[PDB]
Design a binder for this molecule. Structure first.
Ligand SMILES: O=c1ccn([C@H]2C[C@H](O)[C@@H](COP(=O)(O)O)O2)c(=O)[nH]1
Ligand code: SF4
Length: 206
């Protein structure tokens, strides 16, 4: 099923990342430039999971390097979390996208539940490799990957969750995706940023 046979029996993140480059677990590898594995080391206490690499990440080979990542950086710094101490990844490892004519970037398309479930063996391998104390789930796709397809981020914001399905039983904190804080009225963007900082601090206080 999905990516499972492409995942090697090792927890070395370098070997896992190289193997993900060869994954064909769903259709998304075809049009993407490369797989984007997570970034960080196995000593990390906090793992953070987004949806997928975007346009910038697809070509950089690293997660959260575009506008959403710069906003995330600002939130982390405000929460006194050192990004180099995190393990940062995504629920799906290949960018799913289209282009619009006259557009200034490739625009992401939402992974189907099928693609999320197909790619989840990589996330499980990352979680068993890193053994985080806490997992921050940035946005609906990542949160649903571990908490179920019906899960609503908006309804559980600053809550420490635990589900028996997850290897290692880390605490789980589901929050807004940083990209959602890029646009909208200023007061709403400012209130939403504060809430993201709060949720990051919940995770770091686990
Ligand atoms: O590492 C990443 C980078 C971007 N994303 C998402 C965030 C946004 O909704 C889109 C585009 O990211 P952006 O940094 O805003 O260009 O992809 C992600 O889920 N994980
Ligand atoms: S998105 Fe995930 S399951 Fe699909 S081909 Fe890429 S690494 Fe494999």
């Amino acid at each position: 099923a999905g990516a499972q046979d492409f995942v090697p029996h090792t927890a070395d993140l370098a070997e896992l990342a190289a193997a993900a480059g060869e994954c064909r677990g769903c259709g998304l590898y075809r049009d993407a430039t490369q797989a984007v594995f997570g970034a960080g080391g196995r000593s990390a206490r906090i793992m953070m999971i987004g949806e997928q690499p975007g346009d910038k990440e697809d070509l950089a080979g690293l997660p959260f390097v575009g506008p959403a990542g710069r906003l995330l950086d600002r939130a982390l710094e405000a929460a006194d979390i050192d990004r180099d101490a995190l393990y940062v990844t995504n629920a799906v490892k290949h960018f799913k996208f289209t282009r619009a004519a006259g557009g200034k970037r490739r625009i992401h398309k939402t992974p189907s539940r099928t693609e999320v479930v197909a790619c989840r063996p990589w996330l499980i391998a990352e979680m068993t490799s890193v053994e985080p104390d806490v997992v921050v789930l940035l946005g609906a796709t990542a949160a649903k990957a571990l908490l179920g397809n019906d899960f609503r981020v908006t309804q559980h914001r600053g809550e420490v969750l635990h589900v028996d399905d997850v290897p290692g039983d880390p605490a789980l904190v589901a929050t807004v995706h940083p990209s959602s804080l890029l646009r909208g009225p200023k007061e709403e963007r400012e209130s939403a940023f504060a809430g993201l900082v709060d949720d990051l601090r919940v995770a770091a206080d686990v």
